[PDB]
Amino acid sequence: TRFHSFSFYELKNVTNNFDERPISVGGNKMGEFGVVYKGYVNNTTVAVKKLTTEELKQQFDQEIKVMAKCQHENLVELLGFSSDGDDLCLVYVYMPNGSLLDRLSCLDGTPPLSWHMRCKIAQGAANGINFLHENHHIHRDIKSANILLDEAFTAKISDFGLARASQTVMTSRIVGTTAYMAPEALRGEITPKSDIYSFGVVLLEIITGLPAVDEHREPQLLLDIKEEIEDEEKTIEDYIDKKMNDADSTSVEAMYSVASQCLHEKKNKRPDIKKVQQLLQEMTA
Ligand SMILES: Cc1nc2cc(-c3ccn[nH]3)c(NC(=O)c3cccc(C(F)(F)F)n3)cc2n1C
Numbered sequence: 001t002r003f004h005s006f007s008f009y010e011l012k013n014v015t016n017n018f019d020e021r022p023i024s025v026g027g028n029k030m031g032e033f034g035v036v037y038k039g040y041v042n043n044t045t046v047a048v049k050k051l052t053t054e055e056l057k058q059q060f061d062q063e064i065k066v067m068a069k070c071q072h073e074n075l076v077e078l079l080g081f082s083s084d085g086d087d088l089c090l091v092y093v094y095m096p097n098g099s100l101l102d103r104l105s106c107l108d109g110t111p112p113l114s115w116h117m118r119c120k121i122a123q124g125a126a127n128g129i130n131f132l133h134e135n136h137h138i139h140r141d142i143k144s145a146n147i148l149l150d151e152a153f154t155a156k157i158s159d160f161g162l163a164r165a166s167q168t169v170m171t172s173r174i175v176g177t178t179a180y181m182a183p184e185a186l187r188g189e190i191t192p193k194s195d196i197y198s199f200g201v202v203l204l205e206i207i208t209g210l211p212a213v214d215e216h217r218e219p220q221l222l223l224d225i226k227e228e229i230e231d232e233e234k235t236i237e238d239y240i241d242k243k244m245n246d247a248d249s250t251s252v253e254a255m256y257s258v259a260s261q262c263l264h265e266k267k268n269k270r271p272d273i274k275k276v277q278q279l280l281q282e283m284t285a
Contacts (some may be wrong), residue, residue: 001068004080008087014039015048024108031099033059033161038094045094046079051161053086059161060088066160070135074128076148076158095156097149100125100202104144104209104241112243115251117153118206122255123280124155129199130273132157133192136166140190142198143180143212144205164190168267179212179221184267193267196276200262203255209241226263229256254283 012018015037021027028037034051051060060083067078082089097103100121103113113121125147132139139146139157146159162175168191176185182197201212204222212222219225228234236256240247258279264270271279 003078006080006082008082008084011048011082011089014041047092047094049090051088062163063090063161066163072131074124074155076156095148096151097153099145100147101144104205115244115247119284121155122206126277126280128157129195130277133273138164138166138192139195141176142195143177144202166192183265191267193270196262196270200259203259207255208239209243223263226260251283
């Protein structure tokens with residue numbers, strides 16, 4: 001439709017024959033169910049994601065199905081694709097500032113995100129999840145690594161390969177990232193309410209600047225700090241990222257309130273994305 005059909009050979013020419021060397025050393029590999037390569041079509045920089053074989057083809061076809069129906073400022077934009085043999089490629093609009101994970105970790109010496117930018121990213125990401133949920137899709141892998149940032153640090157949700165259409169069902173194949181996954185999701189339930197839980201973990205990543213899981217940490221899983229703060233063992237202020245100078249307590253506590261609500265172990269007691277949107281909008285009012 002709107003999507004250009006590339007040959008693998010065209011995308012090989014765009015990506016310097018899919019140079020797996022990092023962009024920093026002069027290759028085309030930017031990040032990693034596949035590797036994301038930098039591409040040049042004319043005067044447009046693009047991101048080329050090269051991905052069981054029939055199950056990969058389903059994730060490919062799903063991404064195209066979702067990206068065909070879902071177009072929104074807080075979602076990545078598919079420019080085209082390539083289906084030539086056992087080599088499946090998806091071409092998107094280039095995101096100059098990479099993933100939220102990378103920027104929260106200040107990877108490659110990038111400056112720390114201000115509270116103001118962090119609040120806009122949270123709102124953007126929420127607006128993107130709202131669009132997917134309004135259009136009866138469940139992401140099933142909402143994480144900081146799947147939230148990409150454009151030139152204006154506008155949040156764009158990515159990776160809809162495992163996305164499901166939405167009456168809560170169950171699955172034999174349990175997918176997602178443990179550190180972000182809700183209890184029912186880990187048990188095989190498929191609900192948009194599980195996406196909310198995962199976002200709660202992302203809101204804690206934004207507040208703390210800490211990764212969802214760290215082997216050499218206590219607690220190892222970031223979601224466990226909710227208990228420490230509820231059992232008055234620690235405070236939110238003890239966990240607030242020290243790499244910010246513009247974080248007012250009222251606003252940080254307000255985002256934690258949403259994160260805590262999002263992270264209710266009872267699916268039905270979690271807020272819907274529309275409420276998450278409203279609460280985060282009120283936070284910046
Ligand atoms: C310095 C730097 N690091 C980067 C990391 C990624 C990155 C992290 C994880 N996947 N891709 C990235 N991604 C994209 O441009 C992009 C854009 C749209 C869609 C995708 C898709 F493939 F994920 F669907 N990727 C750009 C990056 N830049 C410019």
